[PDB]
Symmetry: C2
């Protein structure tokens, strides 16, 4: 067991106060956890709009890396 739990550091609520608290906190939860449906779409990415010198090293370290990083 290595999840970080909610801790009541001070105070001792009754079961009904604990239930009210946890229901409120869960309603205040951040919604869906993360946007797992996010999809890669590199069309018109800003790095493709830059002018690069034909001998520019940023062709390797900026342009190519941005296209290839996954």
């Amino acid at each position: 067991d290595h999840e970080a739990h909610i801790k009541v550091l001070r105070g001792e609520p009754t079961p009904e106060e604990m239930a009210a608290l946890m229901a409120v906190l869960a309603s205040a939860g951040g919604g869906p956890a993360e946007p797992v449906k996010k999809e890669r779409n590199m069309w018109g990415h800003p790095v493709d709009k830059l002018r690069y010198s034909v001998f520019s090293w940023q062709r390797v370290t900026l342009l190519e890396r941005t296209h290839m990083r996954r």
Copy 2:
């Protein structure tokens, strides 16, 4: 003197015949004239029309070198 000269390897022409020979050869000699320079114009060069993978090594050894070579 280290020019490569015309040599008459066989025969001994009279001066009139040497003059006829040299006049005809000098009229045949033609084309380049003075060493004019073809002006560099890279617009629409074939290497720019090729598809290169983003990680293609030919971006260095073909595309860039063709643009930079002088």
